[PDB]
Structures are given as structure tokens and as C-alpha cells.
């Protein structure tokens, strides 16, 4: 069909197999870079807002104000641009140029926040603007906000289902907000009702959901492995439905997405390596022979130029 804007257009993304990972091609990869805006955050970008505008919170004339710079600061951005919203986005004013400017061009507000702050400084100034006028401005809180999930379990969980012809056996998804791998999971074992694994996926310098399972001190960390590790359990992470968590380093991840560019053609971001270095892990043990692995790749190679991964 012809979607209305860019919004509608979310999801449909493809089923890959892997060639040099895996055992007997049972590693299959889900490309959420082919997106309005090119990473896996757009159908959250687009769901966030059309729940807001159908429970009223988000009117015309109304303004979306979020402290992210990430996938979801640039989802965010094209959704606003599409459905005719202003949207101001706060961030550390050490960020990239080359993010700056790709915000900008989505005609984003961004307010520049004091470097020596960090996000902290943007999450807080953020809170600030809405609070100065509740009525004019609303923040769209992707870390707690169902409408993150929700999506995930209507479009991306079927997807997986329908392109596998419900042979998916193992989910395999790193976690920044948690919605990805409670979305899809919550389709798969519960609209679908097959009992597969659900693995989250987490940096091994932050190995918050693996501590938090122990009953460990949790202990958060630096690490390179952007989109994921955000060093606290967040609320859409339904740890009730996660049947295994597996960490992964940096170095690793990043090489995974090297491997994966040079080796399968495949055009992964940096947080792709780290869930298929952990898929092929899974991948490689003889209670998996057999299983079909699905992974998420949420964004891809270009928005990681400048970035260690070149």
C-alpha cells in the first residue's frame, strides 16, 4: 500500500541466515536498520506517539521534549517531522557534530547542555522544560512507557513469526530499554503460544540483569556497546518472560560487527555484534543444534562511522 507518512511505513524488516556463524545455518538475523529512520527505535518512535495522540496527551499544537541524542532521540525526530509536531531534543554539548547536525536537519530543537554534566545534565534540563509548561510539553519516557513494548509484541514478535513459519525456537536480543526482547517474547509465547527461549543480551562491564538475577551487588559500568547497557533494570524489561541472559565484552562485539560486514555483507552497528557474538555462543552448544536462533540487529554500519567500530 502507500503508508500516509513516514510513521506508518515502520517494521516489515528482513530475515538474514548466517553463513559463517552458527551451526548448519541455525543463526538467522533481523535486520531493524531497514527502517524510516534506520534503526530498530523507529517503531517505538512511532507507537510512543500515536498512543500519546490517542489517549490525548499529545495534541496539536502540544511539543515533545526528550533527552535523548540515540536511536531513539533520531526515531523521535522523523516521527515529529512526519505527523507535523515541534520536538526539542536536550544533550551534553560534547556530542557530535555529525549528530548534531542529522538532528538538526530532522528540525529538532536541541538545547546544548553543560559538557561537564553529561546525561544527567540533559535528563534533568529536559524534566526542567516540561515542567515549566506541562500543558505545552510532553515527554515520552521510553524506558517505562508500554507503548515501547506494545509495538514490539504487535509487529516485530509476528514478523519473527510469520517469516520463520513459527519455527523461531530462541529470541536473542540485547537490552537497553527492554522493549525489543518483552515485545517479542510476550507475541511468540503468549499470542503465538510457543515455549522458546528468550535470551537478553548485556555488556559483560555492566552486567546489571545478571547480577540483579544472583541477587548480586549491582555493580554498572563503562562499556562501548551503544544502545544497550544502561546500567539499571528498566521498567519495560519484563524480566518474568527472560529465560537465559548472556553477557558479551566490547572488543567482541565489535569485532562481531566487523565479521559480520566483511564476511556476510551484513551492515550491523555495533550492539548487532554483541547480540550475534552471543547467539553464536548459544549457536554453538549441542542443545541448539537443532534450534532455530533469531537475533536482532538493531541499527546499522554508517551511524558508527566515527566510532570505534571503523
Same mark, same amino acid.
Given at each position: ?22 551451526? &548448519? ?9 531497514? &527502517? ?6 523507529? =517503531? ?53 557534530? !555529525? =549528530?548534531? =547536525? ?17 546525561? $544527567?545534565?540533559? @535528563? ?11 500543558? =505545552?510539553?510532553?515527554?515520552?519516557? #521510553? ?10 509484541? !504487535? ?6 513469526? $510469520? ?17 525489543? %526482547? ?12 510457543? #515455549? ?14 545478571? #547480577? ?29 518472560? @527472560? ?26 552497528? %555495533? ?40
Amino acid at each position: 500500500a502507500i503508508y500516509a507518512d513516514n510513521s506508518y511505513s515502520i517494521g516489515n524488516t528482513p530475515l538474514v541466515r548466517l553463513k559463517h556463524f552458527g551451526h &548448519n545455518g541455525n543463526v538467522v538475523v533481523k535486520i531493524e536498520g531497514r &527502517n524510516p529512520s534506520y534503526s530498530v527505535k523507529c =517503531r517505538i518512535g512511532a507507537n510512543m506517539v500515536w498512543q500519546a495522540e490517542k489517549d490525548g496527551t499529545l495534541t496539536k499544537g502540544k511539543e515533545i521534549v526528550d533527552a535523548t541524542s540515540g536511536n531513539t532521540g533520531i526515531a523521535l525526530a522523523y516521527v515529529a517531522a512526519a505527523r507535523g509536531y515541534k520536538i526539542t531534543l536536550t544533550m551534553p554539548e560534547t556530542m557530535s557534530l !555529525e =549528530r548534531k =547536525r542529522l538532528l538538526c536537519g530532522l528540525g529538532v530543537n536541541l538545547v546544548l547542555t553543560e559538557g561537564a554534566k553529561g546525561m $544527567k545534565g540533559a @535528563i534533568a534540563k529536559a524534566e526542567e522544560i516540561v515542567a515549566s509548561d506541562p500543558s =505545552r510539553y510532553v515527554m515520552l519516557k #521510553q524506558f517505562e512507557n508500554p507503548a515501547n513494548p506494545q509495538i514490539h509484541r !504487535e509487529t516485530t514478535g509476528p514478523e519473527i513469526w $510469520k517469516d520463520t513459519d513459527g519455527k523461531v525456537d530462541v529470541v536473542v536480543a540485547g537490552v537497553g530499554t527492554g522493549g525489543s %526482547i518483552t515485545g517479542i517474547s510476550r507475541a511468540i509465547k503468549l499470542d503465538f503460544g510457543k #515455549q522458546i527461549t528468550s535470551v537478553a543480551v548485556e555488556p559483560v562491564e555492566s552486567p546489571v540483569i545478571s #547480577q540483579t538475577l544472583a541477587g548480586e551487588e549491582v555493580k554498572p559500568g563503562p562499556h562501548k556497546i551503544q544502545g544497550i547497557g544502561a546500567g539499571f533494570i528498566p521498567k519495560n524489561l519484563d524480566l518474568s518472560i @527472560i529465560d537465559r541472559v548472556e553477557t558479551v565484552d566490547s572488543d567482541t562485539a565489535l569485532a562481531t560487527a566487523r565479521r559480520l560486514m566483511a564476511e556476510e555483507g551484513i551492515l550491523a552497528g %555495533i550492539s548487532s555484534g554483541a547480540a550475534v557474538a552471543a547467539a553464536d555462543r548459544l549457536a554453538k552448544l549441542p542443545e541448539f543444534a537443532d534450534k532455530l536462533i533469531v537475533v536482532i540487529l538493531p541499527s546499522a554500519s554508517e551511524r558508527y562511522l566515527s566510532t570505534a567500530l571503523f
